[PDB]
Design an enzyme around this catalytic site. Structure first.
Site, short mmCIF file in Angstrom:
data_model
loop_
_atom_site.label_atom_id
_atom_site.label_comp_id
_atom_site.label_asym_id
_atom_site.label_seq_id
_atom_site.Cartn_x
_atom_site.Cartn_y
_atom_site.Cartn_z
N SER A 22 -3.29 -10.65 -7.31
CA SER A 22 -3.39 -9.35 -6.64
C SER A 22 -3.97 -9.51 -5.24
O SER A 22 -4.91 -10.28 -5.03
CB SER A 22 -4.26 -8.41 -7.47
OG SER A 22 -5.62 -8.81 -7.42
N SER A 23 -3.41 -8.77 -4.29
CA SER A 23 -3.91 -8.74 -2.92
C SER A 23 -4.78 -7.50 -2.77
O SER A 23 -4.28 -6.40 -2.50
CB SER A 23 -2.75 -8.74 -1.92
OG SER A 23 -3.23 -8.83 -0.59
N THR A 62 5.92 -11.18 -0.39
CA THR A 62 5.83 -12.16 0.68
C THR A 62 7.20 -12.42 1.29
O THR A 62 7.34 -12.49 2.51
CB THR A 62 5.22 -13.46 0.16
OG1 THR A 62 3.95 -13.18 -0.46
CG2 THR A 62 5.01 -14.45 1.29
N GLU A 84 -1.93 1.36 -9.04
CA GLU A 84 -2.08 0.69 -10.32
C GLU A 84 -2.65 1.64 -11.37
O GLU A 84 -3.47 2.51 -11.07
CB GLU A 84 -2.99 -0.53 -10.17
CG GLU A 84 -4.36 -0.22 -9.59
CD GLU A 84 -5.32 0.36 -10.60
OE1 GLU A 84 -5.13 0.11 -11.81
OE2 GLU A 84 -6.26 1.07 -10.19
N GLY A 136 -0.33 -1.08 -4.84
CA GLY A 136 0.22 0.18 -5.29
C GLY A 136 -0.73 0.96 -6.18
O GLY A 136 -1.86 0.55 -6.45
N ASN A 196 -1.25 -8.29 -12.59
CA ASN A 196 -0.87 -9.28 -11.60
C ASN A 196 -1.98 -10.32 -11.47
O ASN A 196 -3.15 -9.96 -11.33
CB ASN A 196 -0.60 -8.63 -10.24
CG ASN A 196 0.07 -9.57 -9.26
OD1 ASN A 196 0.30 -10.74 -9.57
ND2 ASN A 196 0.39 -9.07 -8.08
N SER A 198 2.93 -7.27 -5.70
CA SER A 198 2.72 -8.49 -4.94
C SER A 198 3.04 -9.71 -5.79
O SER A 198 2.75 -9.75 -6.99
CB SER A 198 1.28 -8.56 -4.44
OG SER A 198 0.37 -8.63 -5.53
N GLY A 199 3.65 -10.72 -5.16
CA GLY A 199 4.02 -11.94 -5.84
C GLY A 199 5.41 -11.95 -6.43
O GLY A 199 5.91 -13.02 -6.80
#
Lengths: 146, 740
Positions: free
Chosen positions: B219-220, B181, B444, B442, B216, B176-177
């Site tokens: 993180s989402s 998006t 991680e 994912g 990250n 993410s990032g």
């Protein structure tokens, strides 16, 4: 026996120095143009792999030519018509049976053993059409005759 | 044939002659094989010769390292390079995929198939990829004919939904990032061809549901599912948004290298004096345990501008402004719950509060009575039979109760915002045949894996199991379509061992749940039960490993992504979620919007079960996004990073599953026109050719339309082709000399 006499006649024809002495290239060509096609590797193997100096340093006589020609006559790995046709087919990307002269020129001058450009222009002149493509099958028939 | 793509043509496919002309390159099938490395773990090199256990390897950098001959591994053929789908490659290996992807990226070839997966690296440069002409011309193109692309799978899923009258959903995995998006935005835009509404809503959810992690910084944590509801005639109708699996322990507890959710930090910004004034905040996060417990703060993105964006999005959105103050004060009150003391009573195990001033502020925030809150907390009341009985709790019990209450109220709050935004989202148009889009973290991997990491790994394990089962079903369908059915063993039980050890009774999760119920529980004896019940008893469970002085090692498992070692300290403390019913009732009587608003392992299990059941009803599709390098620069790629990402993404699992079957499938016509020159002279021709080649039948399966080969057979036929063409060249030279 008759073919031995013909080969001796050819050797006499190809003499240049007048000493009845010619290097190994002339014998190799004589066999090459008279029913057999012994590659350069085979020529080296039957002649003990002469080096750059040995090629024009030492020369053999017809008497020593008898054993090597007798041995070469026993080598039958010469391919087949269908084999050559299939091998040439690999370059028919379009499937139309026409191969441009540039591709075969690069393949011959860059892959496998080397052939002199003078040999190319002497043996590969006039058969190229306007578009510069040579029919590989027709070329096969022509090389089979002459 | 392909020029329709215009300026986008080179990126999706170089050219008819560019790749062909670059195809003819020197290579040795016997002495140009790969070699393991030490820093990149894999490098291109050539072996001088065969010297027993030692091999002289020379790489591009220039070395003379040696590698034991047992782990030496072949190299990809040259004419098979730059392949769109790795499933067709004749040598499936861990470094082969990395090299294929790296060379495709170098040649500005972004997308790449891996069977079902569609890996899409993210270049940090503008491309004509999203050009309107590209999408306009790409419509209606089948998956096979078109070059690999996310639009290809999107169109394929659209067609499948239209035809089969069955729902289709897509799941994306990556970092993410780094483009997540952008990827989702472009996907929804392609469907559109309420984008503005989605992009306006996303920042608010991101702010509510993100935290800074070790790897990250944005993180989402929560899993986001967006359903594009369509019409009966396949016309876009509306959009729906849901959130699942929102972590709550992170809300209360923070790791040393972790931060709480960005909300609290954003509000602590001074640029809004009125909010800080009416929250009664000291403006120092160190004053509060719920925040400063973990890492204080990082630069990362600007908190002030993020809060501006979030509050303006709230302003320009369905709901009013007063409830913005309501939610800000509610979250401030949640923050305030980290200050009570509750000292134990004398000559008794009962607890009694001491600092009863934060209680007053919290009550004022919720408009309740502090005395009532203290009375309820100290002496919770429960209804049994037809009467009510009040019983007290010690300090630890009330601490756990208040923590669980805070977690529950935060979860309810998040659900309430989700419901509000969803209601504001859709329109009055009829809804049918939704298409799913899923965003989740994912697999991680860290050096200090803990309970939250265990839960994330378990969720990813379930997702990978679902993918494997879908792959098996699709392969069975294809094989039965081809009249072939052998070795049709399902792959579910192959990965089911870990799932059973996790969820099943007397499993890891079940053992954890049942142990803490016992009055006297400690971490060491918990590990003791774990070893007694699994050490040797279960194959996946095994002794941990200590390497390079890692922080700690308590127990390790063998996952789909490799061996993972976890830690035990602190799990029992944060696993419990005791919800005080009387306090909930007190909220029910509160004077605020709280009326509308209102172990973790069990809740996680049930939520995962619900999500998996929901997803089982929709045909799946999968997308993968991988960062090429740690730095932001393009072109450069860190091989260890990409290898780790691929290992965690499960792509290696997919290629391994494909390999154990008969991955190579080729047309009879092409095989006859490109490989019959070996022994020249379609059932009889093909069977004769393969019989004369002197190859054991078990290595290949013969079909009626497509011929099935193993990975190594293609390479063997390749050196056979090389030898045959060398002999042909020699014979042609000999004949030409004969002419001369």
């Amino acid at each position: 026996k008759e073919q031995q006499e013909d080969f001796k006649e050819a050797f006499l024809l190809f003499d240049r120095t007048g000493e009845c002495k010619i290097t190994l290239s002339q014998v190799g060509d004589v066999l090459r143009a008279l029913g057999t096609n012994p590659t350069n590797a085979e020529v080296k193997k039957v002649l003990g792999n002469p080096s750059n100096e040995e090629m024009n340093a030492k020369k053999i006589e017809f008497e020593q030519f008898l054993p090597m020609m007798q041995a070469i006559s026993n080598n039958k790995d010469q391919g087949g018509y269908e084999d050559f046709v299939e091998g040439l087919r690999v370059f028919d990307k379009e499937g139309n049976g026409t191969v441009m002269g540039a591709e075969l020129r690069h393949v011959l001058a860059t892959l496998g053993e080397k052939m002199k450009e003078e040999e190319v222009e002497a043996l590969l002149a006039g058969q190229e059409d306007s578009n510069g493509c040579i029919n590989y099958e027709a070329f096969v028939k022509h090389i089979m005759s002459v | 044939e392909m020029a329709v793509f215009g300026a986008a043509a080179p990126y999706l496919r170089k050219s008819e002659k560019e790749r062909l002309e670059a195809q003819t390159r020197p290579f040795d099938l016997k002495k140009d094989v790969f070699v393991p490395d030490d820093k990149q773990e894999f490098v291109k090199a050539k072996i001088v010769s065969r010297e027993g256990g030692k091999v002289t390897a020379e790489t591009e950098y220039g070395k003379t390292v040696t590698v034991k001959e047992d782990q030496v591994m072949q190299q990809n053929p040259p004419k098979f390079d730059k392949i769109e789908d790795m499933a067709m490659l004749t040598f499936l290996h861990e470094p082969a995929v990395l090299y294929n992807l790296k060379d495709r990226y170098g040649s500005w070839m972004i997308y790449t198939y891996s069977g079902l997966f569609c890996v899409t690296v993210n270049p940090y440069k503008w491309l004509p990829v999203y050009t309107p002409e590209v999408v306009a011309a790409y419509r209606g193109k089948k998956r096979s004919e078109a070059p690999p692309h996310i639009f290809s799978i999107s169109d394929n899923a659209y067609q499948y939904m239209l035809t089969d009258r069955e729902n289709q959903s897509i799941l994306i995995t990556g970092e993410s990032g780094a483009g997540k998006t952008v990827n989702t935005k472009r996907v929804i835009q392609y469907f559109a061809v309420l984008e503005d509404q989605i992009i306006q809503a996303n920042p608010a959810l991101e702010a509510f549901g993100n935290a800074k992690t070790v790897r990250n910084d944005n993180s989402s944590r929560f899993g986001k599912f967006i359903r594009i509801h369509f019409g009966a005639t396949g016309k876009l109708a509306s959009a729906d948004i849901e959130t699942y699996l929102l972590e709550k322990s992170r809300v209360i507890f923070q790791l040393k290298a972790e931060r709480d959710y960005h909300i609290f930090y954003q509000i602590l910004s001074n640029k809004k004096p009125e909010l800080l004034d009416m929250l009664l905040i000291t403006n120092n996060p160190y004053d509060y345990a719920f925040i400063s417990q973990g890492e204080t703060t990082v630069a990362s993105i600007d908190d002030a501008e993020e809060l501006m964006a979030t509050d303006n999005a709230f302003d320009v959105l369905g709901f009013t402004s007063e409830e913005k103050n309501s939610m800000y004060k509610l979250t401030g009150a949640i923050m305030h719950f980290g200050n009570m003391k509750f000292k134990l009573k004398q000559r008794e195990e009962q607890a009694e509060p001491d600092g009863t001033e934060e209680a007053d502020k919290s009550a004022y925030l919720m408009g309740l009575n502090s005395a009532d809150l203290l009375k309820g907390l100290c002496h919770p009341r429960v209804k049994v039979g037809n009467e009510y009985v009040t019983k007290g709790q010690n300090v630890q019990q009330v601490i756990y109760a208040t923590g669980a209450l805070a977690k529950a109220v935060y979860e309810r709050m998040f659900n309430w915002m989700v419901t509000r935004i969803n209601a504001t989202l859709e329109t009055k148009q009829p809804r049918q045949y939704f298409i799913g889009v899923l965003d989740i973290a994912g697999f991680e991997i860290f050096d200090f894996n803990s309970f939250e990491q265990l839960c994330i790994n378990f969720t990813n394990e379930k997702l990978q199991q679902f993918f494997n089962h879908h792959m098996f079903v699709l392969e069975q369908e294809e094989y039965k379509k081809e009249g072939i059915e052998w070795t049709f063993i399902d792959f579910g039980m192959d990965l089911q061992a870990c799932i059973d050890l996790i969820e099943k009774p007397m499993g890891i999760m079940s053992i954890l749940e049942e142990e803490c119920m016992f009055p006297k529980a400690t971490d060491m004896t918990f590990k003791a039960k774990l070893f007694d019940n699994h050490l040797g008893k279960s194959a996946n469970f095994q002794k941990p490993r200590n390497i390079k002085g890692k922080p700690e090692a308590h127990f390790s498992l063998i996952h789909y992504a490799g061996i993972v070692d976890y830690n035990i300290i602190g799990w029992l403390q944060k696993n419990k979620d005791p919800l005080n019913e009387t306090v909930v009732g007190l909220y029910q009587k509160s004077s605020l919007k709280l009326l509308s608003t209102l172990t973790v392992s069990a809740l996680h299990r049930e939520n995962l079960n619900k999500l998996m059941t929901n997803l089982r009803s929709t045909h799946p599709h999968f997308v993968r996004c991988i960062i090429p390098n740690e730095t932001k620069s393009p072109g450069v790629m860190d091989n260890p990073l990409v290898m780790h990402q691929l290992r965690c993404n499960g792509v290696l699992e997919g290629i391994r599953i494909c390999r154990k079957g008969f991955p190579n499938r080729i047309l009879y016509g092409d095989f006859r026109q490109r490989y019959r020159i070996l022994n020249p002279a379609s059932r009889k021709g093909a069977e004769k050719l393969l019989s004369s080649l002197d190859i054991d039948h078990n290595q290949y399966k013969f079909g009626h339309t497509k011929v099935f080969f193993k990975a190594g057979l293609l390479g063997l036929l390749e050196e056979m082709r090389d030898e045959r063409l060398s002999r042909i060249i020699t014979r042609i030279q000999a004949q030409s000399r004969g002419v001369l």
